[PDB]
Amino acid sequence: AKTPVIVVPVIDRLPSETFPNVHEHINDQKFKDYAFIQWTGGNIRNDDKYTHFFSGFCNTMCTEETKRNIARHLALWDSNFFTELENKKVEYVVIVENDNVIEDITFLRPVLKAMHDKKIDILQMREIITGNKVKTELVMDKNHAIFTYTGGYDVSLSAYIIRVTTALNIVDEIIKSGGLSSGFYFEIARIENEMKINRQILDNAAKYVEHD
Ligand SMILES: [Mg+2]
């Protein structure tokens, strides 16, 4: 059962630029270890039914820009594709916005194994909060240690690995609780905390996933 590796377009360029050293083709989708995919749903105007991701209010309304960015992900988490991955017992998906570059995907294999073994639900592959962190070793890649630290109020959806049922549970709770309103990323953090979801931040993420 292959691990989906999903490119989410946020700028206009080919998905091959995100994975410049992958020698295959990346297939589109809407509505050897890896299945490379580009997810094209969840986009702006086509969202009369993404309204349940957000509360009725906020300001006058939330900016179409902030909503659009998070909607792309929530739509993916809430897709028939994901529920089918749950049916098919696929454990994790790798999700990367296409303004990132991952030159070397070999780190993913030992990282995914270690995540499985250590019951990690989310590996966030972009850092947000600066300052000293409490690191723990995740796994050794060739001759270098890969470290993580526990996530807090530093959610980013730029690039991450997530357990399929974890993604499904989060977006379902968002829908249940009436949609996001203000402090989108804070609320995602709180939902994860309430569910005792284990989110780790990849330390020195920039080494593995270069952000544009
Ligand atoms: Mg990004």
Question: Three-state SS for 124?
Answer: strand
Which residues does 39 contact at the CB level (< 8 Å), separation at least 6? Answer: 6, 7, 8, 9, 29, 30, 72, 76
Report the separation in Å between the CA atom of 111 and the middle of ligand 1, taken as the mean of its atom positions: 21
- In the sheet that holds 144-150, the strands lie side by side as 27-29, 34-39, 3-8, 92-97, 159-163, 122-124, 199-202, 144-150, 136-141
- d(CA 123, CA 138) in angstroms, rounded, equals 10
Task: Give Cα separations from 50 to 67, 174, 178, 187 (angstroms).
Answer: 10, 12, 12, 18
Distance 100 CA to ligand 1 centre (A): 6
What is d(CA 43, CA 12) in angstroms, rounded to the nearest whole number? Answer: 13
Residue 180 is given by DSSP the state: B
The structure was resolved experimentally with: X-ray
Task: Give SS3 for 67.
Answer: helix
3-state secondary structure of 94: strand
Question: What is the residue whose two structure tokens read 């009725």?
Answer: 56
What's the gap in Å between 159 CA and the centre of ligand 1? 7
How much distance in Å is there from the Cα of 185 to the middle of ligand 1?
Answer: 14
Provide the residue type at 23 as one letter: H
Ligand 1 centre and the CA of 73: distance in Å? 12
Instruction: Please answer whether residues 192 and 170 qualify as being in contact, where contact means their C-beta atoms are separated by less than 8 angstroms.
Output: yes
User: What secondary structure letter does DSSP report for 2?
Assistant: P
Number of separate domains in the chain: 1
Distance from the alpha carbon of residue 191 to the mean position of ligand 1, in angstroms: 22
**How far, CA to CA in Å, does 159 sit from each of 8, 28, 61, 201, 210?**
9, 18, 27, 11, 10
Resolution of this entry, Å: 1.9
Query: What is the domain extent for residue 138?
Result: 1-212
Give the residues after which the backbone of the chain is interrupted, taking a C-to-next-N distance over 2.5 angstroms as a break. 31
Q: Rounded to the nearest 5°, which phi and psi values hold at 197?
A: -75, 135
Whole-number Å distance, alpha carbon 189 to ligand 1 midpoint, is 18
How many A from CA of 97 to the centre of ligand 1?
5
CA 66 to ligand 1 centroid distance, Å: 13
Question: What separation in Å is there between the alpha carbon of 212 and the centre of ligand 1?
Answer: 7
User: Measuring CA to CA, which residue among 156, 165, 160, 146 is closest to residue 186?
Assistant: 156
Distance 18 CA to ligand 1 centre (A): 11
Q: In the numeric block, which tokens belong to residue 29?
A: 């989708």
